[PDB]
Amino acid sequence: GKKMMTTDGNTATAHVAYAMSEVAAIYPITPSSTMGEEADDWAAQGRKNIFGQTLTIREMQSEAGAAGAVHGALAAGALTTTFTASQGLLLMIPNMYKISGELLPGVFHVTARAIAAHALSIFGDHQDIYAARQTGFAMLASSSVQEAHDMALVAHLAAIESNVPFMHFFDGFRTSHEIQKIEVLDYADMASLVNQKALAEFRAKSMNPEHPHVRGTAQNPDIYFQGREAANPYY
C-alpha cells in the first residue's frame, strides 16, 4: 500500500507515470528531463507497470515528433504519456488538438516552464501550460511534491475513464526539483483504481485492421461545426 519516500516532484510523478503508461514517446527539455530518464532507467531495470510489462519508451527527433508518436500509440490502443515543458510543449500543440479531438486518454506531465521571448529561461512559470489552454486537454495542477504524486494518479485514471486527454502540471524547478519527504502508493493500489470496462472500451475503439475505421477526415462547412460539438458530453 503506502510507502514513505524522500524525492522531488519529477520522480514522485515519474513513479505514477511509469505504472499507468504502456508507451512513452520522449524528448528531453529542462526541467522535465529527469522524468523521461528515470522511466528509461526503470525499464532497463525491468520495472513493471500495472499490466506487468516494462514501459516502451523511444526518444524522438523533437517534441512535435514525440507528440506525433503519442497520438499514434493512443490511436492504436496503448496508454501513453510524455514528459515535457515550455518550448517543447509548444511543439506538441498541433497534436494536442488532434489527441483531444479524437478523445484519447493521453496524459502529459509537464514541468511548467517559461517561454523564450526577450530571453530564454529554463525556470518556472505558467506561460507554457496557458499556451495549451485552448487545445481541449484537461489541466490538473499540483502545488507540491506530494500533490504531484496524487494529481499524476488522478490524471491518468480520469483520462482512461473520461476519454479526455489530461495534462498534469507542476512548477518548473520550484516543485520538480524540490525534494520532500512524501508518501507514494504501490503500483497495485494504482492498478485497483482503474476502470477496466473503460479500459476495455479504449482498446476496442482503437485502430485495428481487423475492425477498421477512418479517422482524421477532411470536413466541409456542412458538417464540421456539428462534428466539433459532438464531444460536449465528455467534457
Ligand X SMILES: Cc1ncc(C[n+]2csc(CCOP(=O)(O)OP(=O)(O)O)c2C)c(N)n1
SS3 168: strand
Write out the binding residues for a copy of itself, residues 133-192 only, by CB under 8 A. Answer: 133-134, 136-141, 143, 151, 171, 173, 177, 179
Residue 145 parent element (H or E): helix 145-162
Q: Is 215 annotated as a binding residue?
A: no
| Nearest-approach distance from CB 192 to ligand X, in angstroms | 36
Cis peptide before 165 (omega within 30 of 0): no
Does residue number 115 form part of the binding site for ligand X (CB under 6 A)?
no
Interface size with a copy of itself, residues (CB under 8 A): 125
Question: 165 and 132 in contact (C-beta within 8 Å)?
Answer: no
Question: 184 and 151 in contact (C-beta within 8 Å)?
Answer: no
Residue from 32, 34, 81, 87 binding ligand X (CB under 6 A): 87
Per-position x/- string for 115-134, each x denoting binding to a copy of itself as judged by CB under 8 A, each - no binding:
xxxxxxxxxxxxx-xxx-xx
Residue with the CB atom nearest ligand X in the bound state = 87
Q: For residue 52, give every residue at least 6 positions away whose Cβ sits within 8 Å of its Cβ, in sequence order, or none.
A: none
Q: What one-letter code names the amino acid at 180?
A: Q
For residue 176, which of 208, 149, 212, 213 has the smallest C-alpha distance?
149
Write out the binding residues for ligand X, residues 20-59 only, by CB under 6 A. Answer: 27-29
Write out the binding residues for a copy of itself, residues 66-95 only, by CB under 8 A. Answer: 66-78, 80, 87, 90-91, 93-95
Site residues (CB under 6 A) for ligand X?
Answer: 27-29, 62-63, 87-88, 91
Annotated binding site for thiamine diphosphate: 63
